[PDB]
Amino acid sequence: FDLLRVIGRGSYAKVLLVRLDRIYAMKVVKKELVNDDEDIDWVQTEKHVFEQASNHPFLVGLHSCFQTESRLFFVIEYVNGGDLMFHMQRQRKLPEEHARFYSAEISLALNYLHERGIIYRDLKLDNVLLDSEGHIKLTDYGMCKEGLRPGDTTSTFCGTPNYIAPEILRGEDYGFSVDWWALGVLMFEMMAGRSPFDIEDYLFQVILEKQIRIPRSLSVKAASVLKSFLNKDPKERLGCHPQTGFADIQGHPFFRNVDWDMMEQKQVVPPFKPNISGEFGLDNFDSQFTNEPVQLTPDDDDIVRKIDQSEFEGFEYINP
Numbered sequence: 001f002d003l004l005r006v007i008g009r010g011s012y013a014k015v016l017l018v019r020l021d022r023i024y025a026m027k028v029v030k031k032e033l034v035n036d037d038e039d040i041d042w043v044q045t046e047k048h049v050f051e052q053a054s055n056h057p058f059l060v061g062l063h064s065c066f067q068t069e070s071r072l073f074f075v076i077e078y079v080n081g082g083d084l085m086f087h088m089q090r091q092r093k094l095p096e097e098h099a100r101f102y103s104a105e106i107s108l109a110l111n112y113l114h115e116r117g118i119i120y121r122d123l124k125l126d127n128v129l130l131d132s133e134g135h136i137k138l139t140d141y142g143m144c145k146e147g148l149r150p151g152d153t154t155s156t157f158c159g160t161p162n163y164i165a166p167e168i169l170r171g172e173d174y175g176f177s178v179d180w181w182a183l184g185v186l187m188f189e190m191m192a193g194r195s196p197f198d199i200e201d202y203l204f205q206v207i208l209e210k211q212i213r214i215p216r217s218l219s220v221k222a223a224s225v226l227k228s229f230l231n232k233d234p235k236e237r238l239g240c241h242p243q244t245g246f247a248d249i250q251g252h253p254f255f256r257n258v259d260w261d262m263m264e265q266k267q268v269v270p271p272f273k274p275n276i277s278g279e280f281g282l283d284n285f286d287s288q289f290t291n292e293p294v295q296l297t298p299d300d301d302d303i304v305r306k307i308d309q310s311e312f313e314g315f316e317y318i319n320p
């Protein structure tokens, strides 16, 4: 198609802005990475999430997918509002009311996956996304793990060093408890204005053996959700309860004010509508300088003859 700009450029994939007559966002994964022994799982996994997550309001939905021999292309809806990381620098710290809006919606998003069996595990201020209306969307279903949820604890050992679950660092079996810990780090940063880790391999040690300091300015309800969400024990941690895990989150005093049936229909009013910039909304969003020009890398024949398109079959075909 016609490719307007490069949005993000991770090692596994490249995110670039496109049009065809609506603006869309495209994540392109080279096929050599995913086509191997027990590697096909990441492309397949993300598709399943995207299929299950596209109906949900908060998790981002996927228009189309196409296949070329050299790469696999994902077309995802363009969100205009902005990422939280830019918001956090525009406003060092956010009120507790703003955090309740965002964090409440995020907990709904994670529960949907938890019910479905998927662990986001890439929860970050950047991975959340804001629409022009002020709601939240979660972006990169890439590190997710799906297909095993009730009575299943599995160790895939993925996380981000700052948002990493303490139980995971230990080498222990990880449930959906990691995702809730990531929430508390998110909530922490927005309300306090700083990472809870006073911010290489030193972080893993701090998280496991250093105390978390709640700002004195923080409301007592806020301290408790942080303490319970950022709790080191997966069994003690809030919302990792096997039976009654969402109600206690939902009935926590910090999130008493919300109406979650009402908020899920986007009925509740966002605290601050994001700034309306050019139809693209490129101004509000961060601008990363890895590759300013969008030129897809020229293919090498020797790889291309090795890739099996049997594995990459049934792409271009998306279920619900």
Ligand SMILES: Nc1ncc(-c2cccc(N3CCNCC3)c2)cc1C(=O)Nc1ccncc1
Residues within 6 Å of the ligand: 007, 008, 015, 025, 027, 060, 076, 077, 078, 079, 080, 083, 126, 129, 139, 140, 141, 282, 285, 286, 287, 288
């Ligand atoms: N759907 C989207 N709509 C808009 C944006 C967007 C728009 C402008 C700038 C940015 N930035 C990302 C953060 N770094 C600075 C550039 C993202 C991203 C996405 C999106 O899905 N992204 C994404 C990123 C990584 N894996 C899957 C999906």
